Amino acid sequence: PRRAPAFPLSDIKAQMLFANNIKAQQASKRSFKEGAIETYEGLLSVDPRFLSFKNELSRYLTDHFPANVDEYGRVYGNGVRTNFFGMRHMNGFPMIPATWPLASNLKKRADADLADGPVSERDNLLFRAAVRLMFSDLEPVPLKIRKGSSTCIPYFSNDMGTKIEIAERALEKAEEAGNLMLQGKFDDAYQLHQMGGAYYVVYRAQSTDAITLDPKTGKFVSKDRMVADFEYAVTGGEQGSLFAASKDASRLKEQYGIDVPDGFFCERRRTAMGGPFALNAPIMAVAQPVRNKIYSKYAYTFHHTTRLNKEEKVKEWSLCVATDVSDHDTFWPGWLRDLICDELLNMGYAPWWVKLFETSLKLPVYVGAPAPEQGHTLLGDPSNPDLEVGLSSGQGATDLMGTLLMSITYLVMQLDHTAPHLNSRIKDMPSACRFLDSYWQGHEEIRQISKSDDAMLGWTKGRALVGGHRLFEMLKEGKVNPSPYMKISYEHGGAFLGDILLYDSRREPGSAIFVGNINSMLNNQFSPEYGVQSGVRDRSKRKRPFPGLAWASMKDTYGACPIYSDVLEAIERCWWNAFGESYRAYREDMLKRDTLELSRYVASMARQAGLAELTPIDLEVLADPNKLQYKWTEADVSANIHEVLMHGVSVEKTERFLRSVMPR
């Protein structure tokens, strides 16, 4: 059913993806790399004292605080959902090999019994209504760019000046490039305007992954992570193999002279993609206004800030169902891309813009280094983009694509299993739009709070209520998938956007509270995804600009966890045993240094201003800006802090661009 074309780096098609500069050329050739991350300044992830600390702490916490999750996946009591063994990884050393990204998910979806299009006309109207509501009356805003982010194919520039030039030129030339693509002249659009080419595959660490302690021997077992070899990826699973990657860390002693303590493993590695920035800029120019619309008009369903902001909504529900989606990005359907594009064309969106948008979700992928002596291969032909990878992580509107698919998928699940009497309200496009507009504002008796593949489904006092309980029962039983679109299950230990929903004896949303996930505190403090990058002079360009700041927001983020105090004391005791030092004093020093360093970046901040004016969100984001890409948005961050991490293209240039894209 059609193998995707593949080209080695030596091939001209792959060579064309990399500009004649050191950064781009290094990116093309970058071999498999592994090594200990600098967890904190002067501390490596594999430091023997640090691993001794992690061994003692993970064992102690699991022992004293076993998971409190009921048969329905509801968290109660201590607020713990699993063991604390997830920290037992040799950060910077990946599982081998990493997966080759699937060039086509058509067979993956078909074999998982998932739909190749909207099942009913109602569903077709609902997916189309989602497009209409999300993309309608948009307001232009400056195109914001993350400082230090790469422009990827073809330039691989990290320079803000160069990135602003690229983005402004892209907004000027998007029309001409889109029109070339409409003529099937993809190579011309890429050669002239760098719009096309491929996504650049980077493998990102999922620093913590499941580990269990088998009671019979007291030996640890890491969660098997299935990977596709090259053959499987190009054939969409028709040929080749899907097998468990090796997380065995024994190799580190022989290869690097690193002592590997018992029950420590290599990290899970996930595919992540970097989009060609010239193609992403025109997409982002529309995506940001869309976010502003959905987070304002549809704030009920889409705008999530604090644990209390989420709590106010959930407390009003009679039933709360915390869902889980299996491998969202890889299962994301291409037919949805086509439906979205078709509906945007119907709305009167510029055909050239829709073509750029369509093309961004069919683009080839350049595979770097999944393992030693593997990779450096382009999948798909950039002359005619036709990949079905699912959702590319580096596409300019990935969050919106995931949110659109999932919001409608959950609504359809609630309609199918709990609310058939609402079907008559969805007769045509105007009525589908009225219903969806009402549903998204939380005005219906069936409700939801969602962001991409994370959601909580709600039922108020209902006639759909009884159906809601049957659906929850079906999810617990787990024998039948409740959706035709994606593989849905219930979350084992229900959480929403990092916050655990802590139930009491009644097991009802009305008396349940949202608390910080204590395990995430431990993940963030002891298993960061990246090193401190102390060699990167401009801190605003680092993956972790001000790590010390997370100490100041810790009480606010995690304080409500039942075991918060117990964990901090266990950390102090274990850190004393391993280093002969106070962890609290160590973090207070890092906080002091990072607070002082921050004033250099903030114009409004005097030489020794302090953190008084900053919110806990601002502090969590300054320690980890990756939270700005999955947890929060621009509006949630103080304006003076947003300027530290982002720079923008003028609203004058974007306003003119947006007027040319949008209907009338």
Annotated binding site for Mg(2+): 453, 490, 494
Residues 82-111 that bind Mn ion (CB under 5 A): none
How many other CB atoms are found less than 10 A from the CB of residue 529?
18
CB-based burial, 368-386: b 16+ in 10 Å, e otherwise = bbbbeebbbbbbbbbeebe
Query: What is the 8-class DSSP label of residue 450?
Result: E
Site string for Mn ion, 409-448 (x = CB under 5 A): ----------------------------------------
Query: Nearer to Mn ion by C-beta: 560 or 611?
Result: 560
Which one-letter amino acid corresponds to residue 494? G
Our CA angle for 515, 72, 58, nearest 5°, is 55
Query: Nearer to Mn ion by C-beta: 150 or 481?
Result: 481
Query: What is the 8-class DSSP label of residue 388?
Result: B
From CA 541, how far away is CA 631, in angstroms rounded? 20
- Does 453 sit near Mn ion (CB under 5 A)? no
Scanning 98-106, 110-118, 401-409, 488-496 for contacts with Mn ion by CB under 5 A, the matching segment is 488-496
Identify whether the C-beta of residue 124 lies closer than 8 Å to the C-beta of residue 514: no
* Residues forming beta bridges with residue 502, ordered by sequence position: 75, 513
From CA 552, how far away is CA 440, in angstroms rounded? 35
Query: Nearer to Mn ion by C-beta: 357 or 496?
Result: 496
Kindly give, in sequence order, each residue whose CB lies less than 8 Å from that of residue 95, ignoring residues fewer than 6 positions away: 225, 245, 246, 247, 265, 266, 267, 268, 269
Query: What is the 8-class DSSP label of residue 500?
Result: E
CB of 68 to Mn ion, least distance (A): 17
From CA 203, how far away is CA 549, in angstroms rounded? 27
Query: Nearer to Mn ion by C-beta: 283 or 495?
Result: 495
Number of residues near Mn ion (by CB under 5 A):
4
Query: Nearer to Mn ion by C-beta: 38 or 491?
Result: 491
CB of 130 to Mn ion, least distance (A): 21
Identify whether the C-beta of residue 484 lies closer than 8 Å to the C-beta of residue 323: no
Site string for Mn ion, 305-324 (x = CB under 5 A): -----------------x--
Binder among 388, 454, 529, 636 for Mn ion (CB under 5 A): 454
Scanning 157-165, 240-248, 454-462, 596-604 for contacts with Mn ion by CB under 5 A, the matching segment is 454-462
Scanning 126-134, 284-292, 452-460, 606-614 for contacts with Mn ion by CB under 5 A, the matching segment is 452-460
From CA 571, how far away is CA 525, in angstroms rounded? 11
CB of 449 to Mn ion, least distance (A): 10
Query: Nearer to Mn ion by C-beta: 321 or 404?
Result: 321
CB-based burial, 630-654: b 16+ in 10 Å, e otherwise = ebbbbebbbeebbbbbbbbbeeebb
From CA 445, how far away is CA 317, in angstroms rounded? 9
CB of 517 to Mn ion, least distance (A): 10
Measured CA distances, 265 to 208, 231, 547 (Å): 10, 27, 25
Residues 322-341 that bind Mn ion (CB under 5 A): 322
CB of 28 to Mn ion, least distance (A): 38
Query: Nearer to Mn ion by C-beta: 431 or 489?
Result: 489
What number of residues does the chain have? Answer: 664
Cα distance between the two ends of the chain: 42
Query: Nearer to Mn ion by C-beta: 81 or 653?
Result: 81
From CA 347, how far away is CA 137, in angstroms rounded? 11
CA 366 to chain centre: 20
Scanning 26-34, 72-80, 161-169, 450-458 for contacts with Mn ion by CB under 5 A, the matching segment is 450-458
Site string for Mn ion, 268-307 (x = CB under 5 A): ----------------------------------------
Query: Nearer to Mn ion by C-beta: 391 or 449?
Result: 449
Burial class (CB in 10 A: 0-12, 13-18, 19+), 289: buried
Residue with tokens 């983020």: 557
- Does 491 sit near Mn ion (CB under 5 A)? yes
Kindly give, in sequence order, each residue whose CB lies less than 8 Å from that of residue 221, ignoring residues fewer than 6 positions away: 211, 212, 213, 214
Query: Nearer to Mn ion by C-beta: 489 or 626?
Result: 489
CB of 457 to Mn ion, least distance (A): 11
Measured CA distances, 647 to 23, 160, 573 (Å): 22, 8, 43
Scanning 196-204, 421-429, 449-457, 581-589 for contacts with Mn ion by CB under 5 A, the matching segment is 449-457
CB of 475 to Mn ion, least distance (A): 13
CB of 206 to Mn ion, least distance (A): 16
Query: Nearer to Mn ion by C-beta: 517 or 525?
Result: 517
Query: Nearer to Mn ion by C-beta: 73 or 140?
Result: 73
Residue 279 gets the label, from left (phi > 0), alpha (psi -120 to 50) or beta, of: alpha
From CA 231, how far away is CA 124, in angstroms rounded? 35
From CA 342, how far away is CA 130, in angstroms rounded? 13
Scanning 441-449, 453-461, 619-627, 651-659 for contacts with Mn ion by CB under 5 A, the matching segment is 453-461
Binding positions: 453, 490, 494
Residue 112: half-sphere exposure toward Cβ, Cα within 13 Å: 25
- Does 499 sit near Mn ion (CB under 5 A)? no
CB of 320 to Mn ion, least distance (A): 11
CB of 456 to Mn ion, least distance (A): 7
CB of 402 to Mn ion, least distance (A): 13
Which one-letter amino acid corresponds to residue 429? M
CB of 314 to Mn ion, least distance (A): 12
CB of 451 to Mn ion, least distance (A): 9
How many other CB atoms are found less than 10 A from the CB of residue 576?
13
Burial class (CB in 10 A: 0-12, 13-18, 19+), 609: middle
Query: Nearer to Mn ion by C-beta: 358 or 454?
Result: 454
Query: Binding residues for Mn ion, per CB under 5 A?
Result: 322, 454, 491, 495
